[PDB]
Amino acid sequence: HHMLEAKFEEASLFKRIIDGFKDCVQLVNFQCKEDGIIAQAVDDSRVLLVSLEIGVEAFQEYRCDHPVTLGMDLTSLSKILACGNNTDTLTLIADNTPDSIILLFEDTKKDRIAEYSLKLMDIDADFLKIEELQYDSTLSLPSSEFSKIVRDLSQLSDSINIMITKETIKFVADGDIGSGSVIIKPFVDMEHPETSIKLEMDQPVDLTFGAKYLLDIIKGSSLSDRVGIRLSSEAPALFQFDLKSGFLQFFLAPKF
Amino acid sequence: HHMLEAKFEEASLFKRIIDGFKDCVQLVNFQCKEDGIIAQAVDDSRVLLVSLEIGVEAFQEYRCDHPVTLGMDLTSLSKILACGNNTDTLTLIADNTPDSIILLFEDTKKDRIAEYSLKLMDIDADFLKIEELQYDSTLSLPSSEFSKIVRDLSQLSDSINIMITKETIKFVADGDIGSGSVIIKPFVDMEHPETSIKLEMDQPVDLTFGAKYLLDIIKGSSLSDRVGIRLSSEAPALFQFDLKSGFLQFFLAPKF
Amino acid sequence: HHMLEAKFEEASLFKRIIDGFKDCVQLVNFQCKEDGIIAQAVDDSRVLLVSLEIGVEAFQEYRCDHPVTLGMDLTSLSKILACGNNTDTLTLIADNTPDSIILLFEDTKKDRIAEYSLKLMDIDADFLKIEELQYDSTLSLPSSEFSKIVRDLSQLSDSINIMITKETIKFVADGDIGSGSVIIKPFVDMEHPETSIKLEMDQPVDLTFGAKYLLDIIKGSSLSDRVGIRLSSEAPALFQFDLKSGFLQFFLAPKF
Numbered sequence: 001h002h003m004l005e006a007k008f009e010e011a012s013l014f015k016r017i018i019d020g021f022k023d024c025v026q027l028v029n030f031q032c033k034e035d036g037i038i039a040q041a042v043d044d045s046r047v048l049l050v051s052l053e054i055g056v057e058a059f060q061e062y063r064c065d066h067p068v069t070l071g072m073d074l075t076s077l078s079k080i081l082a083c084g085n086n087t088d089t090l091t092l093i094a095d096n097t098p099d100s101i102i103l104l105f106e107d108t109k110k111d112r113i114a115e116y117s118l119k120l121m122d123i124d125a126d127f128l129k130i131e132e133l134q135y136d137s138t139l140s141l142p143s144s145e146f147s148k149i150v151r152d153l154s155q156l157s158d159s160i161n162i163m164i165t166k167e168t169i170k171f172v173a174d175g176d177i178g179s180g181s182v183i184i185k186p187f188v189d190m191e192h193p194e195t196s197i198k199l200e201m202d203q204p205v206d207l208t209f210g211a212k213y214l215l216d217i218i219k220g221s222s223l224s225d226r227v228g229i230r231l232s233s234e235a236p237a238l239f240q241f242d243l244k245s246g247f248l249q250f251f252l253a254p255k256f
Numbered sequence: 257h258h259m260l261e262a263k264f265e266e267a268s269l270f271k272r273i274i275d276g277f278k279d280c281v282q283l284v285n286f287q288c289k290e291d292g293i294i295a296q297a298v299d300d301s302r303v304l305l306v307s308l309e310i311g312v313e314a315f316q317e318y319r320c321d322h323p324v325t326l327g328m329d330l331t332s333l334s335k336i337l338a339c340g341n342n343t344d345t346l347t348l349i350a351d352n353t354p355d356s357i358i359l360l361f362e363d364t365k366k367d368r369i370a371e372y373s374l375k376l377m378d379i380d381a382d383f384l385k386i387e388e389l390q391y392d393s394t395l396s397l398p399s400s401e402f403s404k405i406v407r408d409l410s411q412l413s414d415s416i417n418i419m420i421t422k423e424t425i426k427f428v429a430d431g432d433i434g435s436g437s438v439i440i441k442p443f444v445d446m447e448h449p450e451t452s453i454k455l456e457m458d459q460p461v462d463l464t465f466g467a468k469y470l471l472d473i474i475k476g477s478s479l480s481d482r483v484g485i486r487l488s489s490e491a492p493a494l495f496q497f498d499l500k501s502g503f504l505q506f507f508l509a510p511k512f
Numbered sequence: 513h514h515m516l517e518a519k520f521e522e523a524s525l526f527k528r529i530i531d532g533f534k535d536c537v538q539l540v541n542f543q544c545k546e547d548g549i550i551a552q553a554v555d556d557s558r559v560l561l562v563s564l565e566i567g568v569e570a571f572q573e574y575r576c577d578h579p580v581t582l583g584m585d586l587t588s589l590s591k592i593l594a595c596g597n598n599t600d601t602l603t604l605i606a607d608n609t610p611d612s613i614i615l616l617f618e619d620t621k622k623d624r625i626a627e628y629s630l631k632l633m634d635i636d637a638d639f640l641k642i643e644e645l646q647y648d649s650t651l652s653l654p655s656s657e658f659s660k661i662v663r664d665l666s667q668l669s670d671s672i673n674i675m676i677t678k679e680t681i682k683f684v685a686d687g688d689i690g691s692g693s694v695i696i697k698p699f700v701d702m703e704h705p706e707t708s709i710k711l712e713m714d715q716p717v718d719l720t721f722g723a724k725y726l727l728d729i730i731k732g733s734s735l736s737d738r739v740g741i742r743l744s745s746e747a748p749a750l751f752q753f754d755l756k757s758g759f760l761q762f763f764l765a766p767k768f
Contacts, residue, residue, distance in 0.1 A: 197367070
């Protein structure tokens with residue numbers, strides 16, 4: 001015992017994971033299984049889904065005797081998760097049929113220990129599996145560039161339109177003061193693989209998304225310096241920031 | 257074609273020019289002429305005039321077939337002008353009888369292009385020529401010091417008084433909590449010409465200015481590390497921050 | 513003359529002293545005596561007392577012909593004390609039966625002088641002497657760690673409980689979202705004396721304090737990288753940040 005004990009070497013990883021999506025959802029259902037953690041959250045309007053996978057390899061110690069679903073409020077969780085040092089050892093702890101989850105920050109010298117208890121919510125766990133097999137288009141680019149594009153075009157419009165034609169990625173915003181149009185071209189840079197812009201287009205796309213939601217999605221930069229985007233004319237877009245053993249995904253419904 | 261094409265090597269220059277005076281005026285009339293750009297703006301209360309000159313030498317490419325007057329709202333313009341990278345190539349573009357102006361940010365590698373359109377205002381262009389031949393006093397000092405003096409004395413009073421006697425520059429503020437008085441002495445420092453404080457006094461002066469307006473005027477520091485001030489008992493004061501090929505001027509009316 | 517002339521080599525020291533406690537009191541009575549300065553302030557609810565001592569050795573020049581009591585408003589004083597450069601020479605100046613105190617910032621090169629006048633308040637000077645001879649417990653630790661503990665646990669509760677048992681220091685907060693418990697262990701580190709955590713316990717203690725007030729008390733970090741805490745079951749706790757020739761003390765009443 002206890003039933004669940006998940007020990008990150010550095011609290012920084014989980015701090016950043018929660019930074020990745022704390023601003024766009026109020027409630028989150030974590031599910032800790034023998035093979036690692038997954039989590040889902042949806043916003044008030046059911047246009048944004050957050051899906052998280054943390055494999056067992058991301059922990060320095062992991063044990064979960066039985067799957068549990070832990071419902072948490074993001075304000076409470078983020079407050080508590082701000083209490084660590086980035087280099088502290090962090091341990092999620094839970095018992096059978098838990099009323100709360102324990103977060104244990106431990107010093108690297110063993111001088112101090114900060115133990116926090118977080119009351120859990122009751123949340124009916126209706127996990128969605130909306131990821132498609134094929135998407136019309138797939139691209140990947142540096143997350144900082146995605147952030148710059150989104151933050152720029154957000155000043156002009158509530159809505160940002162992503163258009164993909166062969167060898168051409170285009171972001172557009174139209175508003176009262178004016179309009180903006182960023183055109184980026186795919187290229188593989190061998191001197192700096194991290195700057196590359198990659199595109200695979202089985203079918204061209206023209207989709208519109210709420211700027212409010214893209215502004216939250218770009219906060220996945222805290223986890224990865226690149227972002228993958230999968231776009232479908234019939235389904236939500238998928239924005240993915242990889243971990244070394246997992247990922248953070250945002251599924252965002254286009255505007256009709 | 258087009259009629260007007262003005263290409264800054266770095267968007268940073270125009271970004272800073274607009275930072276210099278975006279906070280003190282809502283509307284601005286630019287006038288692009290064969291020999292460069294000038295611009296004017298006045299505030300709601302007609303106590304502050306902003307006058308800008310950008311010579312042809314400040315651009316890496318400049319062409320303007322015919323003079324045009326472009327009325328712009330500062331909020332819109334500043335929003336759009338925040339969208340560039342500082343090292344991007346920036347190009348103002350306009351056509352005959354334009355309804356909008358285009359701002360084109362281009363990558364140094366040609367990977368991406370951000371094109372923005374800004375709707376223009378209708379503004380009757382009544383350009384003022386209020387600069388005097390002789391001013392009672394003329395001084396110059398490091399813009400950071402001007403900013404420190406103004407920001408300090410602004411905490412004590414709505415009004416800051418500039419007094420000039422021979423070899424003595426003095427700033428004063430009187431208020432409820434108390435009063436403050438900064439006295440600076442002219443000196444030419446050869447080890448650091450940029451720190452010098454220079455004064456020419458044909459007649460002593462004693463003028464009062466609204467602190468709210470000096471607080472905006474000091475934002476011309478983004479363009480030059482020195483500021484020139486010309487003071488007249490009968491006319492608005494002139495605060496000037498030079499460019500390598502132009503200048504930014506603020507004419508501020510004294511309080512009666 | 514004048515009667516009082518107290519000259520700090522760097523305005524930074526007094527700037528930091530006032531930063532130490534400007535946020536927790538509105539009015540302050542300074543008392544300048546032949547042997548240095550002391551000061552007291554109490555908050556609206558008479559749960560927090562601020563006590564300051566600045567010995568003559570902390571000044572580069574000090575002269576006070578006769579004790580004076582100077583009542584000052586913290587907003588006014590802090591505004592004026594923000595007007596200096598950290599390396600300016602600062603001089604407090606007062607005359608017999610003063611209506612105001614003068615603060616004189618002087619350049620190290622003698623180029624400029626900023627002279628400020630601060631109107632004084634009328635405050636009946638009822639100085640308290642509530643410090644005890646013996647306290648149940650006494651500890652000391654790095655002020656940054658005290659700040660981290662307080663800022664963390666403040667997110668969870670209005671109240672923070674300090675428990676001291678032999679060789680164990682414990683901070684606790686209980687709230688709606690959950691609870692937190694930091695346990696620190698005394699240790700003397702010879703490689704870094706500044707990181708040590710020292711404890712002397714004549715009797716164990718269990719005291720509760722308003723988080724709002726601890727959040728202000730931790731701002732004494734601007735004066736010292738260590739904090740001493742003296743805890744009594746019958747009296748206010750004493751939080752002390754030392755100067756090289758004086759100290760800043762906060763006496764905080766426990767919650768019944």
